[PDB]
Amino acid sequence: FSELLDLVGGLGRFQVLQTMALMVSIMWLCTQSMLENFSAAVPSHRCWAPLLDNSTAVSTSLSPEALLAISIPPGPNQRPHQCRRFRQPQWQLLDPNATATSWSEADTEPCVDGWVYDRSIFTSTIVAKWNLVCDSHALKPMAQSIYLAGILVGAAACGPASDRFGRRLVLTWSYLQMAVMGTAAAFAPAFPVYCLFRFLLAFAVAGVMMNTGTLLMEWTAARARPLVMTLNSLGFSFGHGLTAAVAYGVRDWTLLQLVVSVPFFLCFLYSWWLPESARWLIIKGKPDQALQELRKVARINGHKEAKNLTIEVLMSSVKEEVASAKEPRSVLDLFCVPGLRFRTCISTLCWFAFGFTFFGLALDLQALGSNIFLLQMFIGVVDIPAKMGALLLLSHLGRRPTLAASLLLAGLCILANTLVPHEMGALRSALAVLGLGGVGAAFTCITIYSSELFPTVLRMTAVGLGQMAARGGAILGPLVRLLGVHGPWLPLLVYGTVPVLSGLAALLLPETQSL
């Protein structure tokens, strides 16, 4: 194919404008995923109680702390209980000479009159809107899991649709569906409906992710291909900073979700000016249309020499791409061939570990430190040098030790985050950020390494199995957070163990750098 790109301009003005226009969309797409650090933040809460919250009642000489001690019992964290209140005011508990033995569990009841939430950091969140607290606490990670399951299902459906209807067309309607479903999620009347619209938004997020990369590849000359994939990966890095920036100003979840959805109407509009992939058009037997796309790009780049092109030139020079129909393959082939079974297991486990760990940790920054805006910013700022350093080390040291050391760095940081005492918020934040940076670097490594462990006809199938394994592990990510009932050490121990085990396994792969 490359001769046509070289005749049309393989890295010209068009490819520059296209890379910029697609990176910007990836930034906003990243905000959509990271949003529920803020859209679903848990403000501190207690039961509603007459002496505290009945604004029409007669006043008293008591201070707020006195009334609070009189009305809500203490919880383990030296703070008011989040799910109980006293059945009758405990006037006897006001004196400092009182004892915890002065009252019994029968003197307490759950929040019959509902909850009261701290509005000082966020004006509203879904947790406050639908009372996803106490007995209902599981519903937040369930919502996150449903979104990530949407990404898995959407990626499964994207393949057939992208091959049958075209790269740009599926990208276009994915942008529109993201806009519409995000806007609808911002105004959902009930929690089940919010879950449904987040699922249908994720279904489109998968399409944007897949077709952005594909449509960059099929218009980029091979000399520039690694760089363009790297820029695609930096899109998410800047997306984290953008999430912090937008969420710092917009403290209301409805307006926040709306603000991050509205851009995709603009993405939808300008996706009509992109050209459809010329490889796909010729492979599907439409060289007369592919000729128009090629001359369109040439017009943008300025290559008047495109006057040389004809459908005969295209059909003569792209037959080698058309010939790919000869050799089908399937996922089971990876496991049948005796030499490829072991590589497949270890590679898939590494993809899984990326997805599981990242979407386990990066969606509860409120547990990792005291300021989630700075945490959300720093997991971008540190992620940039992590990705770039991965590309350096993966060239100097080979694939195997870079992948292994990246995953081991991640796992040992996340595990150390169980031992550092909760008083030391700064050090805990630092270890969390570095642990996430290691996982990003591991993503870079395993993306490249999985493209080399396999023979050329099974390369695509192996990378596909890997990507679906990562998407599948992300589903289990949030659900492991429910183990926090036994103390926050346990979710962190699990999220820390998985990358250590997969990193150790990665040492058993064969090295693939040219030696």
Ligand X SMILES: O=C(O)c1cnccn1
Which residue stretch of 7-15, 53-61, 304-312, 322-330 sits at the interface with ligand NAG (rule: CB under 6 A)? Answer: 53-61
359 binds ligand X (CB under 6 A): no
Which residue stretch of 62-70, 234-242, 367-375, 423-431 sits at the interface with ligand X (rule: CB under 6 A)? Answer: 234-242
Binding mask 56-95 vs ligand NAG (x if CB under 6 A, - otherwise)?
xx--------------------------------------
Give the whole-angstrom CA distance, residue 360 versus residue 356.
Answer: 6
Q: Which amino acid is at 150?
A: G
Give the whole-angstrom CA distance, residue 260 versus residue 239.
Answer: 11
Helices of type H across 187-286: 191-217, 225-249, 253-261, 263-270, 278-283
Out of 50, 226, 302, 455, point to the residue binding ligand NAG (CB under 6 A).
Answer: 50
Burial track 4-20 (b if 16+ CB lie within 10 A, e otherwise) = bbebbbbbbebbeebbe
340 binding partner (options ligand NAG, ligand X, none; Cβ < 5 to 8 Å by kind): none
Out of 383, 412, 417, 468, point to the residue binding ligand X (CB under 6 A).
Answer: 383
358 binds ligand X (CB under 6 A): yes
125 binding partner (options ligand NAG, ligand X, none; Cβ < 5 to 8 Å by kind): none
Instruction: Identify the three-state secondary structure at position 47.
Output: strand
* Contact assessment for residue 41 and residue 121, using Cβ atoms and an 8 Å cutoff: yes
Binding mask 10-49 vs ligand NAG (x if CB under 6 A, - otherwise)?
----------------------------------------
Nearer to ligand NAG, 113 or 452 (CB): 113
First-last CA distance in the chain: 29
Per the listing, tokens 């992710």 go with 209
As measured in angstroms, the least distance from the Cβ of 476 to ligand NAG is: 44
Query: Who's near 260: CB < 8 A, 6+ residues apart?
Result: 28, 31, 32, 35, 182, 246
Which residue stretch of 82-90, 99-107, 257-265, 435-443 sits at the interface with ligand X (rule: CB under 6 A)? Answer: 435-443
Burial track 275-310 (b if 16+ CB lie within 10 A, e otherwise) = bbbbbbbbbeebbebbbebbbbbbebbebeebeebe
* Contact assessment for residue 383 and residue 440, using Cβ atoms and an 8 Å cutoff: yes
436 binding partner (options ligand X, ligand NAG, none; Cβ < 5 to 8 Å by kind): ligand X
112 binds ligand NAG (CB under 6 A): no
Interface residues with ligand X (CB under 6 A) are 236-237, 240, 358, 379, 383, 436-437, 439-440
Interface residues with ligand NAG (CB under 6 A) are 50, 54, 56-57
